[PDB]
Design a protein around this nucleic acid. Structure first.
Ligand SMILES: [Zn+2]
Ligand SMILES: [Zn+2]
Ligand SMILES: [Zn+2]
Ligand SMILES: [Zn+2]
Ligand SMILES: [Zn+2]
Lengths: 137, 1130, 116, 64, 117, 51, 151
RNA sequence: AUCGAGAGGA
């Protein structure tokens, strides 16, 4: 079993009014790549941004791409919780899930908690650790 | 100047000798009791509130001063006389002194009509006195003077005599107070919970515990405080608000010393959000007041309740006075801060088993707990007695008001029974305190007087409190512990271990305000960041800027015997900026040699002055005053860098430490009294050392020098005790050389005839004939004739067959006119030693004589007659029985090698050397290999060397000047095989044995467990009243239990008739008559042959049923519960 | 520490965007925008004719597919309300606390050499 | 902490029932016997003891 | 990214909670107790470091060089001051329990430089 | 049901004081309060006193 | 064996040591040290065994199976070996120390309870205390298993 | 004698 926490490096909540001009400087490429094409309306999107930094090697260890993670997020929460993400090429494995339709800064934390702990990206729940080996006996 | 290595090994032991010349072995008991009498009683009397009683006239009844006189005894006439401890032992008196209290009672009615009447020395009670304490009549007496009072000079004291019985208080472990401890319970609704058992230093009150917890996993951590006397938890921020710190910044100033830390801050935040609703002190005090006093209370009173709890009940050690809430807030914030560090993992959870965290509750503080309770109850009774008189308006006499039996009988009862608490609360009370002093052998007495006890509960199966913690080093014997159900819970002091008696912190506090310290109400919280906190007895008193030179100053004050006394612990935690100073009692510590740059402070000048200790009165205590030695407690050892020996200080090719601060006086002082007997204990498997430490307490010897005058219930004295040929340097202080408990035996380790297999020994019958391991067993019988009332009175007098009713067929001719047998009369089993007759309501008197405990066959050693406390005749008869060792008697070496005597061969039957030496004992070689008691072999070889050389061997544990090679080289110089082997010859045939046998002197012990005190048989003896089954015990002529597992075994055997014999025929056969209709036991009249059930009103269908009596009893007890067990026979 | 890791993505989505440009996204398996990545040439046509036919069929299918008073059903039916109903479910919170408890157990385990 | 309280008006033990309407932040304490009713604001930290507290305080204040 | 600290109101000294102004679409930090407001300079409201990449050098304090029980070494001189000797010790904390990594501290007084190899 | 004397023996003591068994003492308690309650329920007694 | 354990201790100190699968770095270091020291104890035991004659009485009772085992001979002649509490080396009951005689953070064999002496050689005071700790574990096990097995 | 307690033994 692998939860999002096991493969996550660090989570943070920002106040990003514009997706076009993001708060962070290194995420400005793919975000503006995502937004000009109106697959998903800018107006619908909420100001409050959830940015999670995945570490590369944990993703590779479970052979997990951001595609699978984003699919799992969009399945568990449907379209109510938009998620976007870059390719598996950048030096930092990052994906941004700001809500798109108790205040949203509080709400988004409840969402973040619930995602990190009890969203199942892979495996079977209540199988915590597995060891492979050759039996000498 | 410097002590060189070649001298060290006696410099150190010289130092050790001086310690035991100053302190002794029971110093903790005597110091605790002394502190209790000098301080604790006066503190308790003054800390009680004056009892103001008025209808009008009013009276206060101060108590102001105590006087404890010497122990005296009042006869029936009442003339006070000095009572000596041996008289108390013989007459079954309580060795107690009267406590008098000065009382001041001032009349105040009106019009400034004031007048004070002081009653000087109002007899308030009787305090039992610890022997050899400062207030004991044996105090300061010389060995002359003790012998001349019939006291043993080697008797350590440290115990009480209650009703003639010697009682010893066992030190009780408890978890230290006023210290924050953060633990984490795996199975609980809290990730982390911090607690402090706050207790004001002067024992005004019992310890009050505050808990500051962490709610289990907005869902963020929530911090609540469990205050005393408040029904439900409270969020901490409301407690802080209730202390007047309303703004959220002000609260965090106390909780978080560095605001730059994000991570602390975010953790605390949920509690701020959880208390956001309450924003001001009065609502917070409201909120707290609501939980507690009553469901309906006026708002002003609710506030007064919340205030009262906060300043008094919460954290009393911080303060109980008004305007302390800054102190309270800082300490409470410090508790929360500690919780946060534990929750963030910056700091480790506290360890419950660290003795730095534990305190030993000794005789003094325990008697203080009793005295607090009993003086409270006494004052309550004074109030009531005075109150009824004032209600009727008449004057009351204070002497009549004071019923002194409460203090006297309370202390006497609790020390007599061991139930530590009020006699009414006999189940809430904790037993095992105040045990009967072991007087089997001198080592057992010393160990029992140095016994510690961990009240975890023997039922508990968690091994953690039973494990030998690393911190026991030098404090508790690693070996001496019972191997039964209490393993590791009952402990023993290491030899140089000293439990602190307690001290006042006021000199230290006063000095701290000289020096660079700042109060806690006087600082701004911003300063706490890089400053160092200073705790004193748990109490955050201030902060400091340069902790290093503070610690240097404090250490160097304590080493000068300045304001800081020696037992004060001063720990500097460096990584966390605390300096924790401890002066309280119960801290186990030990002495250590201070080390300079890389150099002992102990120079040859100190050893020189110590050598002439008997001339220039240069003692241990001058060694301490010279700043050469220091007492270090368990908690301060964490900051100490110890050298095992001065050889560790020596500059090496690769330096291990190079910054040592202290040195061991000698590592062998980690052992206790009984483990210090073992020779070469570092060559044995440790379980063997533990088993010996247990068995040295069952070894016979001379338990005390004045045994001729003691009327002990059981006593064993060895005819010919010998000091061991192979000894440790610690026994010089245990006085084992002066009261030894064994004999040096020529042990051969051989297989000879097969009668020593599986932990058994073959003894020399001829040696036994010459007195080898012969002992005398003394058994004392009590009796008293009670004239309790004219209805029935007992009296000692030779009974007669014509007047006495319950006269056994045993002859009473050995008794005298007075009803008491005479000394020198040989008495066999079932004989009469005291003829006592009790008047009836075989006429007008019934026999109630005292018989011998059956199957003893001794000789009356002596008969003492006196009067008991109330003053009727009282008789003690000591009977004497010579115990010659025989097959089945248990013997042991000092290495856990126990075994019974398998057979005894005469000298011509035993194997012999070329020079006709036969072994006294032959033990089997198969007892060595699995046990790995190589100390036994090394002791045998060393003993051969010692006997051939005219020495006493040195078997001190860690001694590089003694190993097996050097002993073997010594033994080869006396014409013996260097490894202790000899050619033996078969005693029966005279042929040489092909294997050369290992033979030599080894110290053996005769243990209390003789077969003649264990053999027992039964064939249709007495039965128990309730269930008609055989009694329990040898003494009761009882039967052996055929238990559930024997039943199970015989079921597996398939032996149904044997099982029925054991569980029906041989225990409790019985018949009942059962109604065939209802199956209930009917009424049978076998004389008139009439059989009827009142239930069914039939008298023809009744059946006989053969059942056990216990089953009939069970069925009747089931009807008692309205159950109908109906035995249907169809 | 088998844990083999690599990050090659040479293939591009290359799907035709409405602005006339081909998608340049280096997704491993799925472009979020155009679905499964299929190999395409320089003008964006999928190399496999069967894949092109399937994509065309999918595109055709996608192309195929008191009032004045306030409505209480509007509050019940919206994204924020749905996420709220899910996250704040009795069953859901329990799992969160269970995992956070394991997180605390790790904190407890991380002082090994000591007695505790 | 008991939930049923003695009424300050009729002195009937455990005759007062407390209702916490958290959605409106109001606690209502009513005696079953004498039908006296009192309404106070409450917070999420409030308890029936706090509502009965506010009732006793309101009574004593009004009786001045 | 870095953590975010709590900020307090300047009127009642209570913590400022986040909130959003729709009619400037800008982040504000407002007090629930009074009615003070501030405009944020961060734009970040919450940060969780699951990896816990904490520089334990910040947790060390130079005073630990005074500990007689810590080991000392002459093989790792100080880069600050050139002092020749230095104490060393392990991480010994939660989330530093992995990795026996040694941290060094200079024993020169008033230098107190700390580092890691 | 009062059990018989064998279920609750009155053991005699070194003198003449006959010590009763715990069951006998408890039956003493039950009997006294039963008799006392009986006289209250027979007479006029407060319902809470009878309770 | 000690000088190999020092090798491993520097590798761990310099981060030259990488975990093995299924274990944390602490647990791998502990494995690697314990398996150095068990190799040492077995090798020294072998040396002591081969040194024995067929006049040796320890050997005589071990071949017959009457009493003892080869490990007992190794402990009496060669080396007593590692003392364990709860299946692990001696725990840091002080602050990062097994005793106040060691420096902090000392994972060497001496410090954590390896008795490099035999019973004939005699244990040093620290070895004596650590051996007493291990034997106490045995005594507690013997005294605590009985109730629960009997039930 | 009963009850409890404690200390021990295997
Ligand atoms: Zn019938
Ligand atoms: Zn695409
Ligand atoms: Zn009412
Ligand atoms: Zn504000
Ligand atoms: Zn430096």
């Amino acid at each position: 079993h692998t939860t999002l926490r096991k493969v996550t490096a660090n989570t943070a909540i920002y106040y990003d009014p514009n997706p076009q001009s993001t708060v962070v400087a290194e995420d400005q490429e793919w975000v503006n790549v995502y937004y000009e094409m109106p697959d998903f309306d800018v107006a619908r999107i909420s100001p409050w941004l959830l940015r999670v930094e995945l570490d590369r090697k944990h993703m590779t260890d479970r052979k997990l791409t951001m595609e699978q993670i984003a699919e799992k997020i969009n399945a568990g929460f449907g379209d109510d919780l938009n998620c976007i993400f870059n390719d598996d090429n950048a030096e930092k494995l990052v994906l941004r899930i700001r809500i798109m339709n108790m205040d949203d800064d509080v709400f988004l934390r409840c969402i973040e908690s619930n995602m990190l702990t009890d969203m199942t990206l892979q495996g079977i729940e209540q199988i915590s650790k597995v060891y492979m080996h050759l039996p000498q006996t | 100047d410097e002590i060189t290595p070649d001298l060290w090994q006696e410099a150190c032991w010289i130092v050790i000798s001086s310690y035991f010349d100053e302190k002794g072995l029971v110093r903790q008991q005597l110091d605790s009791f002394d502190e209790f009498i000098q301080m604790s009683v006066q503190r308790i009397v003054e800390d009680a509130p004056p009892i103001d009683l008025q209808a009008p006239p009013r009276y206060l009844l101060k108590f102001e001063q105590i006087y404890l006189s010497k122990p005296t005894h009042w006869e029936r006439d009442g003339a006070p006389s000095p009572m000596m401890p041996n008289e108390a032992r013989l007459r079954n008196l309580t060795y107690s002194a009267p406590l008098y209290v000065d009382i001041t009672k001032t009349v105040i009615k009106e019009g400034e009509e004031q007048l004070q009447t002081q009653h000087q020395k109002t007899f308030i009670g009787k305090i039992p006195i610890m022997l050899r304490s400062t207030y004991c009549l044996l105090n300061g007496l010389t060995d002359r003077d003790l012998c001349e009072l019939n006291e043993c000079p080697l008797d350590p004291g440290g115990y009480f005599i209650i009703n003639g019985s010697e009682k010893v208080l066992i030190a009780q472990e408890k978890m230290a107070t006023n210290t924050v401890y953060v633990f984490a319970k795996k199975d609980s609704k809290y990730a982390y919970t911090g607690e402090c058992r706050s207790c004001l230093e002067n024992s005004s009150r019992p310890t009050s515990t505050i808990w500051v917890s962490m709610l289990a996993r907005a869902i963020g951590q929530r911090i609540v405080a469990t205050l005393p006397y408040i029904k439900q938890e409270v969020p901490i921020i409301i407690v802080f608000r209730a202390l007047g710190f309303v703004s959220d910044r002000d609260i965090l100033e106390h909780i978080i010393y560095d605001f730059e830390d994000p991570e602390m801050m975010e953790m605390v935040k949920p509690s701020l959000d959880e208390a956001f609703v309450i924003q001001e002190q009065n609502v917070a005090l409201n909120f707290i007041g609501s939980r507690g006093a009553k469901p309906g209370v006026t708002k002003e009173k609710r506030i007064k309740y919340a205030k009262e709890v906060l300043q008094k009940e919460m954290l009393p050690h911080v303060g109980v006075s008004d305007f302390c809430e800054t102190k309270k807030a800082y300490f409470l914030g410090y508790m929360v801060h500690r919780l946060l560090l534990a929750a963030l993992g910056r700091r480790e959870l506290d360890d419950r088993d660290h003795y730095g965290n534990k305190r030993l509750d000794l005789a003094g503080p325990l008697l203080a707990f009793l005295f607090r309770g009993m003086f409270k109850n006494l004052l309550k009774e004074v109030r009531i007695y005075a109150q009824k008189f004032i209600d009727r308006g008449k004057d009351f006499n204070l002497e009549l008001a004071i019923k002194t039996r409460i203090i006297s009988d309370g202390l006497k009862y609790s020390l007599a029974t061991g139930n530590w608490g009020d006699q009414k609360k006999a189940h809430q009370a904790r037993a095992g305190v105040s045990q009967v002093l072991n007087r089997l052998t001198f080592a057992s007495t010393l160990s029992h007087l140095r016994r510690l006890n961990s009240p975890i509960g023997r039922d508990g199966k968690l091994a953690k409190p039973r494990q030998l913690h690393n911190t026991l080093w030098g404090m508790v014997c690693p070996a001496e512990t019972p191997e039964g159900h209490a393993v590791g819970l009952v402990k023993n002091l290491a030899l140089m271990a000293y439990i602190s008696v307690g001290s006042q912190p006021s000199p230290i506090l006063e000095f701290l305000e000289e020096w660079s310290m700042e109060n806690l109400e006087e600082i701004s919280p911003a300063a706490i960041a890089d400053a160092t906190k200073i705790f004193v007895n748990g109490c955050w008193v201030g902060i400091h800027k340069d902790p290093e030179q503070l610690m240097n100053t404090l250490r160097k004050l304590r080493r000068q015997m300045d304001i800081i006394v020696s037992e004060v612990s001063m720990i500097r935690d460096i990584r966390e900026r605390e300096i924790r100073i401890y002066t309280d009692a119960g801290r186990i510590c030990r002495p250590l040699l201070i080390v300079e740059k890389q150099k002992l402070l102990l120079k040859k000048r100190h050893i020189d002055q110590l050598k002439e200790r008997e001339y220039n009165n240069y003692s241990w205590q001058d060694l301490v005053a010279s700043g050469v030695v220091e007492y270090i407690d368990t908690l301060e050892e964490e900051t100490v860098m110890l050298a095992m020996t001065p050889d560790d200080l020596q500059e090496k090719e690769v330096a291990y430490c190079s910054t040592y601060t202290h040195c061991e006086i000698h590592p062998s002082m980690i052992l206790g009294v009984c483990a210090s007997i073992i020779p070469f204990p570092d060559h044995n498997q440790s379980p063997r050392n533990t088993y010996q430490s247990a068995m040295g307490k069952q070894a016979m010897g001379v338990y005390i020098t004045n045994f001729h005058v003691r009327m002990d219930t059981l006593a064993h004295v060895l005819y010919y005790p010998q000091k061991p040929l192979v000894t440790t340097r610690s026994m010089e202080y245990l006085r084992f050389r002066e009261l030894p408990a064994g004999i040096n035996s020529i042990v051969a380790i051989a297989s000879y005839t097969g009668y020593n297999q599986e932990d058994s020994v073959i003894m020399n019958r001829s040696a036994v004939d010459r007195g080898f391991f012969r002992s005398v067993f003394y058994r004392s019988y009590k009796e008293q004739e009670s004239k309790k009332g004219f209805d029935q009175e007992e009296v000692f007098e030779k009974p007669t067959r014509e007047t006495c009713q319950g006269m056994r067929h045993a002859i009473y001719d050995k008794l005298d006119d007075d009803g008491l047998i005479a000394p020198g009369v040989r008495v066999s089993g079932d004989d009469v030693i005291i003829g006592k007759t009790v008047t009836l309501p075989r006429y007008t008197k019934r026999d109630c004589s005292t018989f011998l405990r059956t199957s003893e066959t001794g000789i009356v050693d002596q008969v003492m007659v006196t009067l008991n406390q109330e003053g009727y005749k009282f008789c003690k008869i000591r009977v004497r029985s010579v115990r010659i060792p025989q097959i089945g008697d248990k013997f042991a070496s000092r290495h856990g090698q126990k075994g019974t005597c398998g057979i005894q061969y005469r000298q011509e039957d035993m194997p012999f050397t070329c020079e006709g030496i036969t072994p006294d004992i032959i033990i089997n070689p198969h007892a060595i290999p699995s046990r790995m008691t190589i100390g036994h072999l090394i002791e045998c070889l060393q003993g051969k060397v010692s006997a051939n050389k005219g020495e006493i061997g040195d078997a001190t544990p860690f001694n590089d000047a003694v190993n097996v090679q050097k002993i073997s080289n010594l033994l080869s110089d006396y014409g013996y095989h260097l490894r202790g082997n000899e050619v033996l010859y078969n005693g029966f045939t005279g042929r040489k044995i092909t294997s050369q046998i290992f033979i030599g002197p080894t110290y053996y012990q005769r243990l209390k467990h003789m077969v003649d005190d264990k053999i027992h048989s039964r064939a249709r003896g007495p039965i128990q009243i309730l269930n008609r089954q055989p009694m329990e015990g040898r003494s009761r002529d009882g039967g052996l239990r055929f238990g559930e597992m024997e039943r199970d075994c015989q079921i597996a055997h398939g032996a149904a008739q044997f099982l029925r014999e054991r569980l029906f025929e041989a225990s409790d056969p019985y018949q009942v008559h059962v109604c065939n209709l209802c199956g209930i036991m009917a009424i049978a009249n076998t004389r008139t042959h009439t059989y009827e059930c009142r239930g069914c009103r039939n008298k023809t269908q009744i059946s006989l049923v053969r059942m056990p009596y216990a089953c009939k009893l069970l069925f009747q007890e089931l009807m008692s519960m309205s159950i109908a067990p109906r035995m249907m026979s169809v | 520490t088998f844990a083999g890791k690599f990050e090659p993505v040479q293939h591009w989505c290359r799907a035709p965007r409405p602005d006339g440009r081909l998608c340049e996204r280096q997704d491993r398996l799925k472009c979020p925008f155009h679905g499964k990545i299929v190999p395409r040439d320089d003008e964006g046509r999928p190399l496999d004719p069967e894949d092109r036919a399937r994509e065309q069929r999918r595109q055709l299918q996608k192309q195929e597919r008191y009032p004045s008073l306030t409505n209480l059903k509007a509050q019940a039916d919206t994204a924020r309300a749905r996420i709220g109903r899910k996250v704040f479910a009795k069953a859901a919170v329990r799992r969160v606390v269970a995992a956070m408890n394991r997180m605390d157990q790790k904190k407890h385990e991380k002082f090994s050499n000591q007695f505790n | 902490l008991e939930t049923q309280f003695t009424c300050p008006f009729c002195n009937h033990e455990k005759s007062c029932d407390v209702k916490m309407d958290r959605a409106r932040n109001t606690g209502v304490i009513s005696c079953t016997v004498c039908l006296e009713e009192f309404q106070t604001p409450i917070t999420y930290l409030s308890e029936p003891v706090d509502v009965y507290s506010d009732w006793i305080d309101a009574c004593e204040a009004a009786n001045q | 990214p870095g953590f975010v600290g709590i900020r307090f109101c300047q009127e009642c000294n209570n913590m400022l909670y986040p909130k959003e102004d729709k009619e400037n679409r800008i982040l504000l930090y407002a007090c629930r107790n009074c009615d003070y407001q501030q405009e944020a300079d961060n734009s970040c409201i919450y940060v969780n470091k699951i990896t816990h990449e904490v520089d334990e050098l910040t947790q060390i304090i130079a005073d630990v060089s005074q500990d007689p029980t810590l080991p000392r070494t002459e093989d790792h001189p100080c880069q600050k001051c050139g002092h020749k000797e230095a104490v060393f010790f392990q991480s010994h904390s939660a989330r530093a329990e992995d990795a026996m990594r040694l941290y060094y501290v200079c024993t020169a007084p008033h230098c107190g430089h700390r580092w890691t190899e | 049901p009062v059990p018989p004397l064998s279920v609750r023996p009155a053991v005699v003591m070194q003198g003449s004081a006959r010590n009763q068994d715990d069951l006998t003492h408890k039956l003493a308690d039950i009997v006294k309060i039963n008799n006392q309650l009986r006289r209250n329920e027979q007479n006029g007694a407060a319902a809470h006193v009878i309770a | 064996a000690k000088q190999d354990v020092i090798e491993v201790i520097e590798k761990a100190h310099n981060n030259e040591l990488e975990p093995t699968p299924g274990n944390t770095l602490r647990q791998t270091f502990e494995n690697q040290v314990n398996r150095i020291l068990n190799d040492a104890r077995d090798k020294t035991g072998s040396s002591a065994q081969k040194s024995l004659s067929e006049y040796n009485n320890f050997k005589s009772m071990v071949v017959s199976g009457a009493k003892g085992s080869k490990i007992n001979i190794s402990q009496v002649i060669a080396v007593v070996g590692q003392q364990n509490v709860e299946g692990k080396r001696i725990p840091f009951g002080f602050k990062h120390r097994t005793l106040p005689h060691f420096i902090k953070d000392d994972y060497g064999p001496e410090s954590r309870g390896f008795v490099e002496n035999s019973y004939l050689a005699g244990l040093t005071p620290t070895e004596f205390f650590f051996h007493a700790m291990g034997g106490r574990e045995g005594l507690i096990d013997t005294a605590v298993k009985t109730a629960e097995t009997g039930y």
